[PDB]
Amino acid sequence: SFRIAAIPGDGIGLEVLPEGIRVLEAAALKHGLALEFDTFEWASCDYYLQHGKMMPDDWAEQLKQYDAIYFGAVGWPDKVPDHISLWGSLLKFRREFDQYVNIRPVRLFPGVPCALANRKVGDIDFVVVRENTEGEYSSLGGIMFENTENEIVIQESIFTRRGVDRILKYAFDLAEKRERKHVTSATKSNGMAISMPYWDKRTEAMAAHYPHVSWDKQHIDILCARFVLQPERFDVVVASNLFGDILSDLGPACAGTIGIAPSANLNPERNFPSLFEPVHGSAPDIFGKNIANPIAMIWSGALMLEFLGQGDERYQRAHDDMLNAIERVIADGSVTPDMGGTLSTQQVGAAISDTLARL
Amino acid sequence: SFRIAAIPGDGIGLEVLPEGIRVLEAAALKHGLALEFDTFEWASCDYYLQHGKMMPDDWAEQLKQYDAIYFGAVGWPDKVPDHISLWGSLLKFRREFDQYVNIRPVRLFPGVPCALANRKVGDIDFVVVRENTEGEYSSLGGIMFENTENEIVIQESIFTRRGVDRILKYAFDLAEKRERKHVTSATKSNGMAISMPYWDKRTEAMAAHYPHVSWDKQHIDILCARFVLQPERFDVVVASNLFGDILSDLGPACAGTIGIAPSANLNPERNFPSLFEPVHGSAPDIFGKNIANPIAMIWSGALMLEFLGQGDERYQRAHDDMLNAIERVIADGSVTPDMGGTLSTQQVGAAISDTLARL
Amino acid sequence: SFRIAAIPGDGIGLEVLPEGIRVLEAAALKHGLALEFDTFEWASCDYYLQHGKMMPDDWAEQLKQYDAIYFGAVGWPDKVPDHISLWGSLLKFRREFDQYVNIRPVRLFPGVPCALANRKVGDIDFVVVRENTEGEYSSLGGIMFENTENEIVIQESIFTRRGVDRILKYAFDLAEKRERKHVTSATKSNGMAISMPYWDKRTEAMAAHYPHVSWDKQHIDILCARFVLQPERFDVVVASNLFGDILSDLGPACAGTIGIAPSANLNPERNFPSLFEPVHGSAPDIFGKNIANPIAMIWSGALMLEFLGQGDERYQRAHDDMLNAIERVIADGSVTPDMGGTLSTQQVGAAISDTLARL
Amino acid sequence: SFRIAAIPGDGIGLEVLPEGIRVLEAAALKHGLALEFDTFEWASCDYYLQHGKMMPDDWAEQLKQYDAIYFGAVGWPDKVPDHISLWGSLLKFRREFDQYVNIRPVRLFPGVPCALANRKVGDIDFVVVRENTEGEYSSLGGIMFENTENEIVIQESIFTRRGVDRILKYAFDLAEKRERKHVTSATKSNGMAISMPYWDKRTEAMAAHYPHVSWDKQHIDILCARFVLQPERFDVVVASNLFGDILSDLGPACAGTIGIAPSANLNPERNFPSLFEPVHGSAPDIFGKNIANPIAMIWSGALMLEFLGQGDERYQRAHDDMLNAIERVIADGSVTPDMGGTLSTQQVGAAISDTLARL
Numbered sequence A, B, C, D: 001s002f003r004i005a006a007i008p009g010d011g012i013g014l015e016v017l018p019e020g021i022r023v024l025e026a027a028a029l030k031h032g033l034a035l036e037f038d039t040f041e042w043a044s045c046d047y048y049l050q051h052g053k054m055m056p057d058d059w060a061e062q063l064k065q066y067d068a069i070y071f072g073a074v075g076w077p078d079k080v081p082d083h084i085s086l087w088g089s090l091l092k093f094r095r096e097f098d099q100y101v102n103i104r105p106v107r108l109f110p111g112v113p114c115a116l117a118n119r120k121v122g123d124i125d126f127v128v129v130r131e132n133t134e135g136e137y138s139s140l141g142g143i144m145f146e147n148t149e150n151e152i153v154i155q156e157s158i159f160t161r162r163g164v165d166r167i168l169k170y171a172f173d174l175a176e177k178r179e180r181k182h183v184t185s186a187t188k189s190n191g192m193a194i195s196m197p198y199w200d201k202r203t204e205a206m207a208a209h210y211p212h213v214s215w216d217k218q219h220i221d222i223l224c225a226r227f228v229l230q231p232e233r234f235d236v237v238v239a240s241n242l243f244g245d246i247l248s249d250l251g252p253a254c255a256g257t258i259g260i261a262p263s264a265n266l267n268p269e270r271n272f273p274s275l276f277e278p279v280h281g282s283a284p285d286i287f288g289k290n291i292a293n294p295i296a297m298i299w300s301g302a303l304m305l306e307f308l309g310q311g312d313e314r315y316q317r318a319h320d321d322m323l324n325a326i327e328r329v330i331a332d333g334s335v336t337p338d339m340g341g342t343l344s345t346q347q348v349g350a351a352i353s354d355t356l357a358r359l
């Protein structure tokens, strides 16, 4: 008996969430899976406008009593400053729930358009392992000599032995379990003269632990190009918070698009609920036009299943299914405008809704 | 009567530098231009191995007596830690010479291969304006509780009203002088909760100064994708140190490559020499195989001219020439392996060496 | 025609302020001095309770239109957190008015009790020069991993070439004008490994500017003892913000007491109003018992005069007077409980009120 | 069978150390105590001049094999920068040996001179509990815009939940075991707006754990005065690194002197050796004149015993003895120039050497 917390948040969160739930309830009934959903108004800019705070003070004790989070997106600069909204909701989720891994599997699905030249289709496959607790995402620092010629602004990056070690481990593992078993650590150990060399110190230190696994270390600029221009190289790519919510948009949209970009925010020791979300944001530019690609949002529930079940081949089943459901509709051509289709958001929700049965 | 300081530095710096000088001495003689070159051993890892320091203590007083710097690249991790080498040489150049603008013009040259799908050729053109004195490139911070379970690592980002204002100005200017006059400021004002919102505060503040110029502000992740997938959008793109030596590799290699990527490190008030370099690094992987694309290195001297002359239509002339010299050889197909050609570095040096006369 | 802003603030500010004004209006009338007082409710915890903020948003434009500030004290932990109240009022005064010098003359007045053993009386005399804009008084930093085993708390000290140079200058000056011309810079350049050595670097650098002036540098611990045990040594003592509102209590109370401790918050270039206050705080423990020593508060107005007049021997006159008015009452024995007397606050206000005429 | 590591270090360390050892070997033989001394050249400026580093790389593995450290003092600005020398030796001791408590018992010994007025003699007694791992003693930060008008200098204070909690505990304990059971936490939670309020947050939090123990919290300025002027008040005084090596000189020399000031650097869980030292430093001003008060140095060995024995009443015995040995010689008048005596350092060593037998 599972319990799932669903939060559409802002913008297209409301839009793509019901079509994530939809294609999931299909497998639920279809495979005898204990999926008992719920919806929460907070973690939105409506809630913030109304209450002064992004969520109620007791959000956690609330959520702690659930198995997983199915999250939409958060942000509406029109009405709420972006830091306020991310820090006040999602950031507190990942943070106070110790979901230190943020993964973003990157792939070309049979027949997806290519914003890269003539690569064999499917010859692209890897995951991106993003530090999600610390690093360059901070609230530390402040403004000095405010409003004067001499104005200074400080921002601390904080790297610790724990967050780094643990995210570095969880990457000599997702490679310890693959065909290539290769790792590229991202760094900028020429620019940053204190943080990155350290990161490299610990990268290097834990290569000595998995001697069969093969690793290199590429400066985030080149890595970004190599990302677009030679995605066959990469198997595992491990990175700091910033070198996470970076790449995340580039990659899943290196050739394809950010509409088909899944992400997972994980607490491996299960001591807290993990959270599942697409890579994209609230996209105010597109909201209420139901044209938004819900694949990322779907792919997300799939991963929610894949992770969530653990000890069942039962839940495992559902994943592959749903990704094939994705896979068909892709080449079947029932897609959203940011991929070719003339279809709508719910259209593409209903298009997946079919294939799951047909096979 | 000009004086130019030439420093190949490490790796392919030695390799691409003599072919930068070459195609430049052609125009010099060809247009009556006061180019009196010189070469310096230091800012290399040979020098560092030998002397303990990347350059002599009196490098500056030395260089201050020259008009411009033609720089190769610096770095050799095999023998010198990357931060030590960048900080000890080039970083001190840009820093102690107040070369706060770092620009990287991004373009498709007639017939360049496309790591983006079917775009009109030449339908891509913009410059990237990179803060080069402060920002996320620091030596501030350090390690606490060293070697223990509790190990912490601090890195300060420092933004000031001066460096920010001045780089933001110098961008409502390179657009104040163009067909589109559009600016995209890069930010991550949802992740970074102190630095980026401030940056945006000052971005916004100086949009009120150039009301004809049009601006938006895109989070560095999306901006990176939009970089690859829709480069026609961008005219001017302004960014912090990190959001500089980032993009710089992606962009000039969004479709094309980092071999044809020029950069300029500028001190507009001319109080110090400006420095001219390609975007790429010492590329140990390729050194001594004379296959390295010297275009970036050439394009660099061109820009050295373009900037350096100022009040001459005399020097201006040379630029356009040399870029056409580039332009022909491109479509003429006399290029290096990272572009299609079977040619060598000096081959491609000699290939440019021709066209400059023929027209 | 002068204009004075009077702000009692919290606690005994209300108490000692009317007795500062009192003995001042005496000299005003007595010497033909343009003193046109005013009183402001804000910079108090009553105002903060009422308005949510320590003062109105337009406090500055308001105050900018006045010549000097006669300030009480600020703080009431019972109702307002101490940082909130200091930062929200007085700290903004000293800060946004560029009052970078904070001086605290330390002396034994004929017949004051001695919390030091058998020193010649009057054999003690020096001033303390306190950096008042930057240093260890910051709002920079923050909390990371909040509420967890791993909780970390960051606080930045910021030293700049401006604030340091300028406070160091203004000290090779108050000694350039004295019998001894000696300077002790306070440091802790063994503990603090970045800030203090730098401070010393610049201390040292500006000893080369006033070669007749004699200087040493004593670690703040020893300096504190030497403060109590050998106060004849010190002429000038220059220090960082923290090594300011430190000493300030010790010294003026090394033997005597914090009730007779004047301070001056100065903007030498007069571009802003200077502020005048006693060294002590709101002293909630004593409030509304009118036993509080108003000397510090009086001594303060005296200094307000001494500084304020500048180009008059006219205003200068008043000072010496008022300090003799102090001096008599001291040995005359008309003092408050923290000095021996059975008298009240207004009693001691009226006791000074006399002597000013009698001579 | 104990093993003791003795390190005179610099200056008067060499001077007062043999007279610490002396009066200790007396009790050793006198009480059947396993004291097997040794002497080490390093942690000195001679060693540093010679080797480039304050101690050998393997100092720790060396020392780890000993029970306690009897330390002299470190520092010689004439030849070695003060931070280099403290950080390179003693600071690494306290740090890498997790000696997080630094205690400084403050007392008037029968007939000691009084740099405070007419207090009952012996009516003064308390200990000072100093955080010794973190706080305001850092190597974090650095210099930005070096050598320019805009020069900035950053220093991080780091407070953690561990170091703070643990030093705060170890103080609701040294009071949980006394006549008064009172605690004064030192703070400056009006100046420092991030660190001190936090410190207070955790002070307050752990008052809820020892409800019988009574506590207040005094701003470090006033606390310093109250230190001199009313030392009967204090029982326990708990403080951050800076508010440690501060007070430490003031207090033990509030009336008396820094020559009779003991300190203890403790690792309560005994997982590492604890270190024992006087409060004073190398005192270059006095070195080689054998006039230096070795009481502090003796008092230190006494405490080394007091702590070291633990489960023996055997070693306990020795302490009281040795302090009475101190106590007599004090009133007996066999003291050093900084207390009245005409005696020398070894004279006063031999003076203690007697009394230990006579009773």
Ligand SMILES: NC(=O)C1=CN([C@@H]2O[C@H](COP(=O)(O)OP(=O)(O)OC[C@H]3O[C@@H](n4cnc5c(N)ncnc54)[C@H](O)[C@@H]3O)[C@@H](O)[C@H]2O)C=CC1
Pocket (backbone or CB within 6 Å): A072, A073, A074, A075, A076, A077, A082, A086, A090, A258, A259, A260, A277, A278, A279, A280, A281, A282, A283, A284, A285, A286, A291, A292, A293, A294, A295, A296, A336, A338, B190, B218, B219, B222
């Ligand atoms: N994890 C989260 O909750 C995230 C929230 N945000 C927030 O959302 C707001 C907007 O951020 P942006 O920079 O625009 O990033 P975004 O993801 O909201 O939009 C990026 C671009 O992709 C388009 N897009 C996004 N999802 C799409 C879909 N599935 N199908 C077709 N097109 C799609 C949008 O129109 C936009 O042009 C901001 O307030 C930002 O802070 C941004 C990133 C992640």
Ligand SMILES: NC(=O)C1=CN([C@@H]2O[C@H](COP(=O)(O)OP(=O)(O)OC[C@H]3O[C@@H](n4cnc5c(N)ncnc54)[C@H](O)[C@@H]3O)[C@@H](O)[C@H]2O)C=CC1
Pocket (backbone or CB within 6 Å): A190, A218, A219, A222, B072, B073, B074, B075, B076, B077, B082, B086, B090, B258, B259, B260, B277, B278, B279, B280, B281, B282, B283, B284, B285, B286, B291, B292, B293, B294, B295, B296, B336, B338
């Ligand atoms: N401005 C500067 O002096 C720079 C120096 N470096 C330093 O140089 C070293 C190597 O850095 P990387 O991460 O490899 O960046 P890189 O520029 O040295 O090489 C990046 C990739 O591009 C290739 N490449 C570079 N220039 C090329 C050319 N013109 N033609 C064909 N291929 C080319 C290289 O083989 C490599 O695969 C490091 O020590 C780094 O710190 C890196 C960037 C800039």
Ligand SMILES: NC(=O)C1=CN([C@@H]2O[C@H](COP(=O)(O)OP(=O)(O)OC[C@H]3O[C@@H](n4cnc5c(N)ncnc54)[C@H](O)[C@@H]3O)[C@@H](O)[C@H]2O)C=CC1
Pocket (backbone or CB within 6 Å): C072, C073, C074, C075, C076, C077, C082, C086, C090, C258, C259, C260, C277, C278, C279, C280, C281, C282, C283, C284, C285, C286, C291, C292, C293, C294, C295, C296, C336, C338, D190, D218, D219, D222
């Ligand atoms: N410049 C300013 O506005 C200052 C404000 N404060 C604030 O005031 C509040 C109390 O701070 P404390 O630590 O008690 O320092 P305080 O100055 O308020 O009191 C220190 C001690 O001296 C006594 N005292 C002060 N002035 C006296 C006088 N003239 N005659 C006789 N006794 C006197 C008080 O009873 C108390 O025991 C806090 O909220 C603090 O932040 C503290 C220092 C300076």
Ligand SMILES: NC(=O)C1=CN([C@@H]2O[C@H](COP(=O)(O)OP(=O)(O)OC[C@H]3O[C@@H](n4cnc5c(N)ncnc54)[C@H](O)[C@@H]3O)[C@@H](O)[C@H]2O)C=CC1
Pocket (backbone or CB within 6 Å): C190, C218, C219, C222, D072, D073, D074, D075, D076, D077, D082, D086, D090, D258, D259, D260, D277, D278, D279, D280, D281, D282, D283, D284, D285, D286, D291, D292, D293, D294, D295, D296, D336, D338
């Ligand atoms: N724990 C340690 O190893 C300490 C080392 N130092 C270092 O030692 C050097 C000197 O520091 P200072 O600021 O002078 O503090 P200090 O302790 O070396 O001397 C302070 C004053 O007390 C006198 N003094 C010290 N011990 C005495 C004794 N037992 N009897 C009579 N007089 C005594 C000295 O002459 C001097 O006037 C510096 O290099 C400093 O960094 C300073 C404090 C502690």
Ligand SMILES: [N+]
Pocket (backbone or CB within 6 Å): A071, A072, A073, A074, A277, A278, A279, A280, A281
């Ligand atoms: N999302």
Ligand SMILES: [N+]
Pocket (backbone or CB within 6 Å): B071, B072, B073, B074, B277, B278, B279, B280, B281
């Ligand atoms: N370069």
Ligand SMILES: [N+]
Pocket (backbone or CB within 6 Å): C071, C072, C073, C074, C277, C278, C279, C280, C281
């Ligand atoms: N005050």
Ligand SMILES: [N+]
Pocket (backbone or CB within 6 Å): D071, D072, D073, D074, D277, D278, D279, D280, D281
């Ligand atoms: N010591």
